[PDB]
Design a protein around this ligand. Structure first.
Ligand code: ZN
Length: 229
């Protein structure tokens, strides 16, 4: 199979955020569009056969609309390298930033899948992370109220693997970024698979915001414009 990746220190994975389904922005230590028509190699590291089959299943949905294909392989150094490290959050580098990640590290992680995971949850989270793998950013419609973060909790969550974000890192990279609307679309698309989920595990009111679980009309149109036939 694939050569194993360097080990995650499971002590750096922060405990006590059970059922926190957070997409983490991640940045390489230091254009993201793939060449059009690319066939991108993907390797899966760990996970059960069931979980790995679901990832394949939903990732490849993007190719219905984009002129990009994912070739799931078990040899060499795949271009996208997917782990299943529990509790680390889910994430992907953006687009061709994957190609900047050392070969012994992952480029994508799914932090909460198991063999009881719903089809909708696989669809939502897999398509979403693969959206970032194609270069899409979060859609975030900033609410009029502002977000009621439990700042203590937010600091604790983002302090560990993979970000290792200090308090100032969190204030600049998280609160600042998500204090205003963020979009890649002309009109906002409440339906986008790329919407940024705000977990109630990180807020104070029980406030949460969720993700749509399938590709929107706008998602389908945008990605075909980026990667046309
Ligand atoms: Zn995301």
């Amino acid at each position: 199979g694939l050569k194993e990746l360097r080990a995650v220190p499971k002590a750096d994975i922060v405990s006590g955020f059970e059922g926190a389904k957070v997409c983490k922005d991640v940045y390489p230590k230091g254009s993201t569009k793939w060449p059009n028509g690319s066939v991108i190699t993907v390797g899966l590291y760990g996970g059960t056969p069931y979980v790995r089959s679901k990832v394949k299943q939903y990732a490849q949905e993007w190719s219905n609309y984009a002129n990009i294909t994912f070739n799931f392989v078990e040899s060499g150094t795949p271009q996208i390298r997917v782990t299943f490290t529990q509790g680390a959050g889910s994430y992907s580098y953006l687009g061709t930033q994957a190609l900047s990640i050392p070969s012994n590290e992952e480029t994508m992680n799914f932090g909460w899948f198991d063999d009881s995971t719903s089809d909708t949850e696989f669809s939502r989270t897999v398509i979403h992370e693969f959206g970032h793998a194609l270069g899409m950013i979060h859609e975030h419609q900033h609410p009029l109220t502002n977000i009621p973060w439990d700042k203590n909790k937010v600091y604790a969550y983002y302090a560990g693997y993979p970000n290792y974000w200090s308090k100032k890192d969190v204030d600049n990279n998280l609160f600042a970024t998500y204090s205003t609307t963020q979009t890649q679309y002309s009109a906002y698309d409440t339906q986008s698979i790329m919407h940024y989920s705000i977990s109630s595990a990180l807020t104070t009111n029980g406030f949460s915001v969720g993700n749509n679980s399938v590709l929107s009309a706008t998602d389908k149109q945008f990605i075909a414009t980026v990667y046309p036939r």
